[PDB]
Amino acid sequence: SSGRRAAVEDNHLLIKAVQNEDVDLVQQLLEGGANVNFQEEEGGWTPLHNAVQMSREDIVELLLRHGADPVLRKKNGATPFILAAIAGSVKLLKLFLSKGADVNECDFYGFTAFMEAAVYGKVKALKFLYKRGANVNLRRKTKEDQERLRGATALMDAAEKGHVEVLKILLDEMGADVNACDNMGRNALIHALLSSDDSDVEAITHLLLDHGADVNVRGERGKTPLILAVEKKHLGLVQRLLEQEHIEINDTDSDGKTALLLAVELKLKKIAELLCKRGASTCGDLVMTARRNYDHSLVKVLLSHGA
Numbered sequence: 001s002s003g004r005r006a007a008v009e010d011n012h013l014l015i016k017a018v019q020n021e022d023v024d025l026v027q028q029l030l031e032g033g034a035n036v037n038f039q040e041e042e043g044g045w046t047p048l049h050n051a052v053q054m055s056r057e058d059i060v061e062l063l064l065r066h067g068a069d070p071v072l073r074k075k076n077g078a079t080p081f082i083l084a085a086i087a088g089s090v091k092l093l094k095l096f097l098s099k100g101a102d103v104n105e106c107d108f109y110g111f112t113a114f115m116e117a118a119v120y121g122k123v124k125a126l127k128f129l130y131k132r133g134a135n136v137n138l139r140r141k142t143k144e145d146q147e148r149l150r151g152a153t154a155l156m157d158a159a160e161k162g163h164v165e166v167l168k169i170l171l172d173e174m175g176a177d178v179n180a181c182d183n184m185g186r187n188a189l190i191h192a193l194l195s196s197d198d199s200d201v202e203a204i205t206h207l208l209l210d211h212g213a214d215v216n217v218r219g220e221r222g223k224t225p226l227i228l229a230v231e232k233k234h235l236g237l238v239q240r241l242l243e244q245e246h247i248e249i250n251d252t253d254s255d256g257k258t259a260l261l262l263a264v265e266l267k268l269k270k271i272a273e274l275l276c277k278r279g280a281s282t283c284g285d286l287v288m289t290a291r292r293n294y295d296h297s298l299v300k301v302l303l304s305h306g307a
C-alpha cells in the first residue's frame with residue numbers, strides 16, 4: 001500500500017517526463033518499470049497520447065517499444081491516431097494505421113481524424129487522410145447517438161475556424177457537400193457567420209456562395225445568413241449576400257424581426273439603406289423604431305421607400 005502509492009508517483013512522473021520532452025528520463029522510468037499504459041484520472045491521458053499531442057515521433061517509438069497500446073483511447077474516446085490529426089503529423093497517422101487504426105474511427109463525440117485535421121487547419125494530414133479513404137461528408141454522431149438512429153461535418157468546422165486553404169480543398173478537390181446541415185439545420189454558411197472569427201469570414205462566405213451554398217437556411221432561431229450578416233453589423237457580408245439572386249430578403253427570424261427591422265433597431269444606416277433597395281417596409285413599425293432611436297437621417301430613408 002506504500003508501494004502502490006510510490007509507484008503511481010513514478011507513473012505520473014513518466015507522463016510529466018514525456019511532457020517535458022526528457023527522453024533520458026522517460027527511458028529511465030520505463031526501464032525502471034513504470035506503467036507505460038498509465039492513464040491519469042483527469043481525462044484518461046497516457047504517455048503515448050501526450051507524446052502524439054506533441055508530435056514527438058521519437059518518444060512515440062520509445063513508448064511503443066516498451067509496449068504501449070497504440071489504440072488505447074482516453075476519456076473522450078479519441079485514439080492516438082486521431083490525436084495525430086490534430087497534430088497534423090502524417091508520419092504518425094501512417095504509423096497508427098499500420099498498427100490497427102481505422103481511417104474513419106471517431107471519438108465519443110463523432111469526431112474523426114479527417115474532422116480534426118479540418119478543425120486544426122492541418123492540410124497535409126487532410127490530403128493524407130483523404131487518399132487513405134477518409135469519409136469526407138460524415139456527420140458527427142456521438143456513440144449513444146448512433147444507437148438511437150438520430151451532426152456537424154468537416155466542411156462546417158473549417159468554415160467556423162476560417163481556414164480558407166482547407167475550405168477550397170474540401171469543396172474543389174475532395175467532394176465536400178456544401179449544403180449539408182447539422183441537427184440544428186445550420187450549414188457551412190451559417191457556421192461561418194456564427195464563429196468568433198470575423199477574420200476570414202468574408203472569404204469563407206464568398207467561397208461557400210460560389211460553390212452553391214443555400215443562402216436561405218433557418219438557423220438556431222430562424223436566424224438566416226442575411227440576419228446574421230446584419231446582426232454582425234457587417235456591410236461587406238450583407239453586400240455579398242445580397243448579390244445572391246434568389247435570397248428571401250423578407251424572411252423573418254424567430255422573433256418576427258426581419259433583416260431590415262434589425263438593421264434599423266441597430267441603427268445601421270448603410271445596411272438599412274442598402275436593404276431598402278429591395279426590402280419590404282410594409283415589419284411596418286420601422287419608422288417608429290427609427291423614431292425611438294432618434295435617428296432622423298434614417299426616418300427619412302425609410303419613408304422614401306414607403307413605410
Ligand SMILES: Nc1ncnc2c1ncn2[C@@H]1O[C@H](COP(=O)(O)O[C@@H]2[C@H](O)[C@@H](COP(=O)(O)O[C@@H]3[C@H](O)[C@@H](COP(=O)(O)O)O[C@H]3n3cnc4c(N)ncnc43)O[C@H]2n2cnc3c(N)ncnc32)[C@@H](O)[C@H]1O
Pocket residue numbers: 040042043044045050053074075076086107109111116119140151152
Ligand atoms: N496533455 C493534455 N492536453 C489536454 N488535456 C489534458 C492533457 N492531459 C490531461 N488533460 C485533461 O483531461 C481533460 C480532457 O481533455 P481531452 O482533450 O482529452 O478531452 C476533451 C473534453 O473533455 C472533450 C469534451 O468536451 P466538451 O464537453 O466541450 O464537448 C465538446 C462539444 O460540445 C462536442 C461536440 O461538438 P460539436 O459536434 O457540437 O461541434 O465536442 C467538444 N469538442 C469541441 N471541438 C472538439 C474537437 N475538435 N475534438 C474533440 N472534441 C471537441 O473533448 C476534448 N475536447 C474538447 N474540445 C476540444 C478541442 N477543441 N480539440 C481537441 N479536443 C477537444 C481535461 O480536464 C484536462 O485537464
